[PDB]
Write a protein that binds this DNA or RNA. Structure first.
Ligand SMILES: Nc1nc2c(ncn2[C@H]2C[C@H](O)[C@@H](COP(=O)(O)NP(=O)(O)OP(=O)(O)O)O2)c(=O)[nH]1
Ligand SMILES: [Mg+2]
Ligand SMILES: [Mg+2]
Length: 430
DNA sequence: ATTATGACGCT
DNA sequence: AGCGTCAT
């Protein structure tokens, strides 16, 4: 009743760039704009692997993880941009720099948590409080929310998408009690106004479009963001959660798309997030552990406490390359040359990171996969990272992995290596 | 022969 | 510390 916390204390937004790498390539090459197009890495094997897809190309069924040759079967006029190759490997520097452009604009409005190359969480609670003081009890015009959807509306007592969007927004705004500056729905609405401004600033200053979700926590903001991509933002209120979750497959919630979500489904015999409400917190903890159980008990009621971390920069800087099937490394000189290529890219990125961000990595993590191991990493070893020198880190990485070589022969490497991965971690201010 | 990362939990 | 999970 009056003591049951409802998880409405914060206003959190999630901003995700639409088909990000495609937009980066379309900005650079206007010939790609407003076309079915995709970004690929490599080319020789099946045309390259697609990692990003414009919405025009998605209409033909083109997806991430497709081979370009197969995508061209679905969409013969598909345009393709390839990721840069440097030192024999894909080099994603252009997209990391574009990401910094967007993150620096977002940081003007609030402290952000960089959650990936193309998305950031924003804690707008304080900014909403400020804007509410400025508004002085003045209602919010629909003109301030020109690209906002209100999830669950319109309801009750009408054919095009924009018309539907505007009907829902009108219902929401008419139901608002703009007197109470502590009303969570009002706070969400003001948060959406601010996110409209942030998205306008990103597009004006970078050319990139994005979508966003606004809700009371990170998981609902992320879910909301997905509901109306591209180039739109969605407000998911606390009140919208029961209907939203009543048909929402468990796997759609971030962190439940893998084995844990499958076990929720199988152990409990349920399909949708809303069905979780019928179990006690202790029941969920008994099946899925204390932390997972408490998190599920709260999440299915729309409640989640994970804070928006003040972290604009990635925590690690890493370099990896697969060597599939027959290109796997089977000689000591091969392993050395590729460790050096990866180490040279890492040294470049680390040096730029130190200059930009006033920090130094102190630990080097070396991960490999061996032929016939279905795991991501077959072996992980750390060593000290004391200087930004590629020859040094590649020799150290070799020193920490060389005992994996089964070959009694010193020239060969067996079993051959199907993946090398160098990761700089444990940053300290410098 | 999806690939290249990044975050984070577990023990 | 090293491994597993999840994301995409
Ligand atoms: N190297 C690599 N990059 C990837 C991979 N998957 C995604 N990316 C890169 C390419 C993506 O552009 C970028 C952001 O990932 P999203 O936000 O999940 N997809 P997007 O922004 O394209 O479309 P949406 O409008 O649905 O948000 O990450 C991958 O497996 N490997
Ligand atoms: Mg995106
Ligand atoms: Mg994203």
């Amino acid at each position: 009743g009056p003591h049951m916390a409802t998880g409405q204390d914060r206003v959190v937004a999630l901003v995700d760039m639409d088909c990000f790498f495609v937009q980066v390539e379309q900005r650079q090459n206007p010939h790609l704009r407003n076309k079915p197009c995709a970004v690929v890495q490599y080319k020789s094997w099946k045309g390259g692997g697609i990692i990003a897809v414009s919405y025009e190309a998605r209409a033909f069924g083109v997806t991430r993880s497709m081979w370009a040759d197969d995508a061209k079967k679905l969409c013969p006029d598909l345009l393709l941009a390839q990721v840069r190759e440097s030192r024999g490997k894909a080099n994603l520097t252009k997209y990391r720099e574009a990401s910094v452009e967007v993150m620096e604009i977002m940081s003007r409005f609030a402290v952000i948590e960089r959650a990936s190359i193309d998305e950031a969480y924003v804690d707008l609670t304080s900014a909403v409080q400020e804007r509410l003081q400025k508004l002085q009890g003045q209602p919010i015009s629909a003109d301030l929310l020109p690209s906002t959807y209100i999830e669950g509306l319109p309801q009750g007592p009408t054919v095009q998408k924009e018309g539907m969007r505007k009907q829902g927004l009108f219902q929401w705004l008419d139901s608002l009690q703009i007197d109470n500056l502590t009303s969570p729905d009002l706070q969400l609405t003001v948060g959406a106004v601010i996110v409209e401004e942030m998205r306008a600033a990103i597009e004006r200053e970078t050319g990139f479009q994005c979508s966003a979700g606004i809700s009371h926590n990170k998981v609902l903001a992320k879910l909301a963001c997905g509901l109306n991509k591209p180039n739109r933002q969605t407000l998911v209120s606390h009140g919208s959660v029961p209907q939203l979750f009543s048909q929402m497959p468990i796997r759609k919630i971030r962190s439940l798309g893998g084995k844990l979500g499958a076990s929720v489904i199988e152990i409990l015999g349920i399909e949708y997030m809303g069905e979780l409400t019928q179990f006690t917190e202790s029941q969920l903890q008994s099946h899925f552990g204390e932390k997972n159980g408490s998190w599920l008990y709260a999440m299915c009621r729309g409640i989640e406490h994970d804070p928006v971390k003040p972290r604009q920069l990635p925590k690690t800087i890493g370099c990896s390359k697969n060597f599939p099937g027959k290109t796997a490394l089977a000689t000591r000189e091969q392993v050395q040359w590729w460790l050096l290529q990866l180490a040279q890219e890492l040294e470049e990125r680390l040096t730029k990171d130190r200059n930009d961000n006033d920090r130094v990595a102190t630990q080097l993590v070396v991960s490999i996969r061996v032929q016939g191991d279905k795991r991501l990493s077959s072996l992980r070893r750390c060593c000290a990272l004391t200087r930004y020198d590629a020859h040094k880190m590649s020799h150290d990485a070799f020193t920490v992995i060389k005992n994996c070589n089964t070959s009694g022969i010193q020239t060969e490497w067996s079993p051959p290596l199907t993946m090398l991965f160098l990761c700089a971690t444990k940053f300290s201010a410098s």
